[model samples]
Target: KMKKILSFDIDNTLNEPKMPIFPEMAELLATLSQKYIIAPISGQKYDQFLIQIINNLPESANLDNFHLFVAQGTQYYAHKAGEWKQVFNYALTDEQANAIMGALEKAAKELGHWDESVLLPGDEINENRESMIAYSAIGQKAGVEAKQAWDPDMTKRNEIAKLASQYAPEFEFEVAGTTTINGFVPGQNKEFGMNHLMEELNVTKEEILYFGDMTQPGGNDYPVVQMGIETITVRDWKETAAILKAIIAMEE
Candidate 1:
């Protein structure tokens, strides 16, 4: 069976952290867009995704079938009517926000990471989203070395996630980018993205192929695998590029 949709994660999965789309990937995406709808799903915000990924795509890339799933699937935006429009937004309530934040902070503290020196710089750990609370162990602006060194094995971040999940069993937790932990409202992870894409686009779970770097258990990409969608867990953008070319070859 041919997969009709190609899904990707941001950060190391699509391109390097905070880097623009590479020429190779941009070219591959443009070519693939000719046959399949390209979807990029990440825990990043809409603005970050646009600035770092979407806006850097080659002009030749076809956006007619493009879709953007961000904020760990809590927010969805699509290119339609000649402009990008919001299809749906799952915003959290005041109480929900407060509770989730409290739990996150508590988890960091329990793991001895509540302080700025231990966590990200004050400006780097952002909490302005409508749907989720995200924490970067290192600042988002930190160099690649810092980000990679923060959690090479994911042991520390996994501990943070465990503590937070204990306090807030109602929310969803995903660790990614080697330095980030995202807390989503229940059902707001990539599973939501898969189901939503299927319903809105009239596709089936088996018809979608999702790619990510953090597909391991307790990682962000785990949920979609549990949902039974086809998933490939890659090491970096280079591996992703190779995988993309192979998929295109097979599909074509």
Candidate 2:
């Protein structure tokens, strides 16, 4: 049998915070709560993910779904009976964290002229990180144009990634959000989290179906997709209802 859907990803997958979700989209998320398991997976860091997502979605926890996975590919939650059941609690290694920090620092300096001109108002390494580097332009709140204009076609990112990889070839680069390329050093993922999540919840992978927008090209949606998990990629929050409505008719 086809497994239940996990309804992964947020931002364009669900509803963009900048706009109101269509009522039917809200209804679909609420309705899916009854059939397949629903989980919010995003590149937004743990607290920031919840801050940017959660509660602000169209409907309250209808059909008893509220679990989440944030921080690029980090694992953090599982919802049961309308409550977040925690699993895979912890983070990247100190050396790994420091590695990313050091590498980004080098990238910043290598592109020092870019930074000096504020060529790309991006994340400055205030402190070392674990498993990933927060890379963005003009901050996350910058307009899409600023974000897009900043990188255009990820040309700068490819350059930065090439340099960073040369420094730390162990890490896998992930372009997340509309403006950030979060570099995870490997091992952090949706399948890894899902295994832990299912073990904690006593569920099966096939028992879940997922929805997301960032499933393409190194986005946070890769794990589930590569693992053969049942998922649907929505173009954006604007199509949430239509996507879910389409999935509703297609039986797993």
Candidate 3:
């Protein structure tokens, strides 16, 4: 069966969390453009994807093929007419947003890990976006290696998520990205990204194949796996590139 949609999680699965795209990965995406609706579903903010991934694409890159799902599917954008446009967004109300932040703060303080300073090494809480609030065990400015190392077992973040969930039952708690626990309204996750893409592109769940590194329980990519959409949990971009090549071979 032909897969009409190709969706990916950006952090560990795509091209290193919050990092530039590799040349080989770039070539793979440009080639995939011709065959699938390639949407990158990530926890990063919209502009961050532009800065980290899209901006670094080669001049021959096929920008038009990208349907960017940011903020863990709370926002969506697509490239059109030589520019990126907002396909849709799911902004929380001011009260809802504040309450979610309040819950995170309460949880962090209870765990003695609430810090917003750029100078700190850990406990960096970010509520800058309209639809999500994230807390990093390592500081936001920490290096990729540090973030990857901070939670190898996922026990620490799991506890944090549990605490946050108790306090913020109104919002869904998610173990997202590297070294972070995030909260968003229910149905606003990578699963939502898949459903939205199906609606927008007119495809079925089986026709949409998802790729990500964090598909284990409590991980960011796990929700889509639970949705039963034929998912692959990849180790890294090199592996993702190989899978994409095989997919091309099978289809082309």
| Local distance difference test values of all predictions, in order | 0.80, 0.60, 0.78
lDDT per residue, candidate 3, 1-252, as tens digits?
477778998887668766777877877787888656788888788887887678877777678888888887778888888999988888888887887778777877788666455335443455546667666665656678767776777777777788988987878877876777777888788878777877877888888889999888867788899989889989988889899888777876
- Superior by lDDT: candidate 1 or candidate 2: 1
Query: Which segments of model 3 are wrong by more than 4 Å?
Result: 115-124, 248-252
TM-score of each: 0.89, 0.75, 0.90
lDDT of 1 by residue, 1-252 (tens): 478899998878889875687888888888898888988888788888888777877887888777888786678888866799888888889898888888878898788876566443446554647777777766656677777877888788889988989999998667777677888788778888777878878888889988987777766788888899999899899999998888778776
RMSD of 3: 2.5
lDDT for residue 45 in candidate 3, whole number 0-100: 81
* Sliding window of 10 residues with minimal summed lDDT for model 1: 117-126
Location of the lowest summed lDDT over 10 successive residues in candidate 3: 115-124
* Ranking of candidates on TM-score, top first: 3, 1, 2
Best-fitting candidate, measured by lDDT?
1
lDDT of 2: 0.60
Instruction: List the pairs of residues colliding in candidate 3.
Output: none
